[PDB]
Design a protein around this ligand. Structure first.
Ligand SMILES: [Fe+3]
Length: 329
């Protein structure tokens, strides 16, 4: 029992958060956990906010979890999302590269094409794909943004600095780091491809199924597999770039209300999880997709006691990120 200050990024998430608050009030008795909403412009401001005791929690893509960990913020993961089904929860998802059918190019011919990324530093939209092309990039490979800017002939990399690297915001001027940028995130990176701005979208396996309901329409897209061949979109299991850890809620290491955060989310999923309520849905919203939590999530799992970002993410993934931020060929 007490108040959890959730950090929403921009207007759409702020709206979902208000609804989340109000509905939780109509079901949770006076002594249960409650929600308060803090609006910030980017996930980055949410991190600082939480570290400065301005807010208490926020869900981040694993790549951004790593950023949350670095000093002086030192946030830790307390609750993770799980996908698939409640019967067989999956704490990972597949990063895929979606292209249009017959666009005429494989993974080893990305140079010169236009790319759509979910956001700078995110697992599927950035780390995995760039990680795999790292040495294909033209030297110098530092700064990384600059090298990526020269490989593609323009792209949309939300959260990148459009001043220092104009080419990274060519498909989405300003590189807005929130849903105010129509090309932000999974569904945004997908729209960037669908509209014809970009040639490839680095998203997750469920994105396309989340945006195109007709097999007819999904049939017009393909996935680039690491063996330089193309496969239909529902064959991602045999055509993906990598498996990455699930998004997770982070909190302060000192006085971070981790117990209250879990009590809230656990009670929230019971009352408003998948197909649980007609008045409100935690994993959906008419105001946007992947607001606060991913729509493709089914519930929450508590993270083991005092586990740090490094352990949570894993040796390999955590290294891939380091290598990306330095690495050699
Ligand atoms: Fe992600």
């Amino acid at each position: 029992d007490k108040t959890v200050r959730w950090c929403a990024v921009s207007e759409h998430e702020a709206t979902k958060c208000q609804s989340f608050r109000d509905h939780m009030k109509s079901v949770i008795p006076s002594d249960g956990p409650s929600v308060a909403c803090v609006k910030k412009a980017s996930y980055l401001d949410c991190i600082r906010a939480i570290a400065a005791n301005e807010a208490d929690a926020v869900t981040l893509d694993a790549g951004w979890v790593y950023d949350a960990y670095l000093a002086p913020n030192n946030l830790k993961p307390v609750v993770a999302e799980f996908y698939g089904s409640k019967e067989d929860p999956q704490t990972f998802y597949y990063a895929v590269a979606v292209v249009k059918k017959d666009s005429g190019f494989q993974m080893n011919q990305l140079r010169g094409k236009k790319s759509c990324h979910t956001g700078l530093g995110r697992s599927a939209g950035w780390n995995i794909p760039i990680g795999l092309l790292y040495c294909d990039l033209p030297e110098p490979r530092k700064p990384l943004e600059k090298a990526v800017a020269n490989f593609f002939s323009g792209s949309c990399a939300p959260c990148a600095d459009g001043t220092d690297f104009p080419q990274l915001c060519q498909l989405c001027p300003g590189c807005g780091c929130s849903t105010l940028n129509q090309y932000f995130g999974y569904s945004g990176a997908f729209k960037c491809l669908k509209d014809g701005a970009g040639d490839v979208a680095f998203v997750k396996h469920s994105t396309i199924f989340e945006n195109l309901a007709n097999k007819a329409d999904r049939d017009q897209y393909e996935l680039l597999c690491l063996d330089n061949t193309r496969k239909p979109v529902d064959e991602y299991k045999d055509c993906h770039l990598a498996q990455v850890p699930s998004h997770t809620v982070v909190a302060r290491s000192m006085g971070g209300k981790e117990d209250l955060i879990w009590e809230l989310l656990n009670q929230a999923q019971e009352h408003f999880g998948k197909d649980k309520s007609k008045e409100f849905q935690l994993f959906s919203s008419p105001h946007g997709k992947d607001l606060l939590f991913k729509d493709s999530a089914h519930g929450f799992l508590k993270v083991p006691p005092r586990m740090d970002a490094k352990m949570y993410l894993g040796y390999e993934y955590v290294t891939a990120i380091r290598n990306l931020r330095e690495g050699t060929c």
